[PDB]
């Protein structure tokens, strides 16, 4: 089994800028080298095959060069819609035997940066039939933000530490902006033992905060 060492793990580049991804094979492969694009929740999409030839419907700003063990993918004129993870791939061994296989790089996540926006933040107090089950889940949403945020929960000013999960949508294909959902889960005994609930979305020096008092909703 060949090892496909793909560099880098993540790259970040402005709209209209250019980017060059690299794969180096630990062993020698064939000129049959390809490159894929994979947006979240979707199957891959073949971009290039035989090292440099484009797949059906790939604009020319996708460019692949290389030979031997190093190969390149170069995306220029970058758009938000290009934000995806990108995989290289090779074939080794003999096509005339059951010896030899295919190897994929470990992927490059391309982050197209647009003009920095700050998230509008919504907080959803747990529905009335949640508390009856013995566990409540407060949900919080950050919309239309760039760049990445970090989320803090404050139960009456005490920064929570546990029972927190986070989920980020893909970069929007138009304005490049993320979205984010953060859930704080507590016992019902906990939740009815405190009044204020706070969701602190932080973007470097900036912070947008959304709150609600339990007796208010």
């Amino acid at each position: 089994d060949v090892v496909m060492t793909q560099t880098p793990a993540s790259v970040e580049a402005a709209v209209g800028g250019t980017v060059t991804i690299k794969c180096q094979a630990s062993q020698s492969i064939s000129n049959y080298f390809s490159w894929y694009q994979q947006k979240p929740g979707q199957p891959p999409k073949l971009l290039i095959y035989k090292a440099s030839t484009l797949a059906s419907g790939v604009p020319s700003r996708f460019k692949g060069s290389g030979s031997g063990t190093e190969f390149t993918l170069t995306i220029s004129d970058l758009e938000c819609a290009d934000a995806a993870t990108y995989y290289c791939q090779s074939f080794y061994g003999s096509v005339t035997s059951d010896y030899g296989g295919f190897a994929f790089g470990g992927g490059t996540e391309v982050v197209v940066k647009g003009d920095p926006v700050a998230p509008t933040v919504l907080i959803f107090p747990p529905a009335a039939d949640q508390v009856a089950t013995g566990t409540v889940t407060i949900v919080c949403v950050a919309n239309k933000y760039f760049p990445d945020v970090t989320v803090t929960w404050e139960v009456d000013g005490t920064t929570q530490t546990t029972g927190i999960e986070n989920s980020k949508t893909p970069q929007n294909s138009a304005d490049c902006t993320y979205n984010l959902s953060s859930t704080l889960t507590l016992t019902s005994t906990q939740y009815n033992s405190h009044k204020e609930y706070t969701c602190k979305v932080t973007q470097g020096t900036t912070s947008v905060v959304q709150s609600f008092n339990r007796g208010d909703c």
């Binding site: 089994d1 064939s30 049959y32 390809s34 894929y36 994979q38 979240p40 929740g41 979707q42 199957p43 891959p44 999409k45 073949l46 095959y49 035989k50 030839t53 797949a55 059906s56 995989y87 791939q89 074939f91 061994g93 096509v95 035997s97 059951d98 010896y99 030899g100 296989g101 295919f102 190897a103 994929f104 790089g105 992927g107 919504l122 907080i123 959803f124 107090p125 747990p126 529905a127 039939d129 949640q130 089950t133 889940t137 949900v139 949403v141 919309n143 999960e165 986070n166 989920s167 980020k168 949508t169 979205n179 984010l180 959902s181 859930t183 889960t185 609600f212 008092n213 208010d216 909703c217």
Partner: protein, 224 residues
């Protein structure tokens, strides 16, 4: 031309599972291989095996899969993957793909046509069906011309769940978030939508195929 993998399920550790790829708009012939590639949640792409679709050709496996996995042609339109001794490393989305060719003789060792994936979840647990709660702003928040409502789908296993809004007539400004897996092994996910305040209620349609669960929650703009 089209692919479609079925058969993914929740299996217990050390069990065995059979996936199936089904072709549409074409049938198998000489010139290309049919292959399986998996992808662990949040991981890269891992090749499993291939088979030359007219059978006479070879059948090559990734070194790590030889012995456990097996690949077969079950018909002119279905290809199968037998999986034995499933660990939790084998938990992944399992894709099926067609080797492309630029000419009639043989492939070009890249996969042009891909199915959507079937999801194998290897776990010591039983399928749990989600609970669904409306997501709606505080009653005490003074309303506005639009509002963001949504649904919390909490505590399901295995994946996936589907969230559709007002039975699919609504998609503008719908955000459905990736699922997170809590420490319990149970997945959760939220999905919101942004509508004008017609006062008309919206309804979310949650489905969990693995428990034959379909539940329909109407989300009032929660003004008490």
């Amino acid at each position: 031309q089209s692919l479609e993998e079925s058969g993914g399920d929740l299996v217990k550790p050390g069990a065995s599972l059979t996936l199936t790829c089904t072709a549409s708009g074409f049938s198998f012939s000489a010139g290309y291989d049919m292959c399986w590639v998996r992808q662990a949640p949040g991981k890269g792409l891992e090749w499993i095996a291939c088979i030359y679709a007219d059978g006479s050709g070879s059948t090559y496996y990734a070194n790590w899969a030889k012995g456990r996995f097996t690949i077969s042609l079950a018909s002119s339109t279905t290809v199968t993957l037998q999986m034995t001794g499933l660990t939790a490393a084998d938990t992944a989305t399992y894709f099926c793909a067609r080797e492309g060719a630029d000419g009639p003789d043989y492939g070009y060792a890249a996969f042009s046509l891909w199915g959507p994936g079937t999801l194998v979840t290897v776990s010591s647990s039983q399928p749990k069906a989600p609970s669904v709660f409306p997501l709606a702003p505080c009653c005490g928040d003074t309303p506005s011309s639009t509002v963001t409502l949504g649904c919390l789908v909490k505590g399901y296993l295995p994946e996936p769940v589907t969230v559709t809004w007002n039975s699919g007539t609504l998609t503008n400004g719908v955000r459905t978030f990736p699922s997170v897996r809590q420490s319990s092994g149970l997945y959760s996910l939220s999905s919101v939508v942004s509508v004008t305040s017609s006062s008309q209620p919206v309804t979310c349609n949650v489905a969990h195929p693995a428990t034959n669960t379909k539940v329909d929650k109407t989300v009032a703009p929660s003004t008490c």
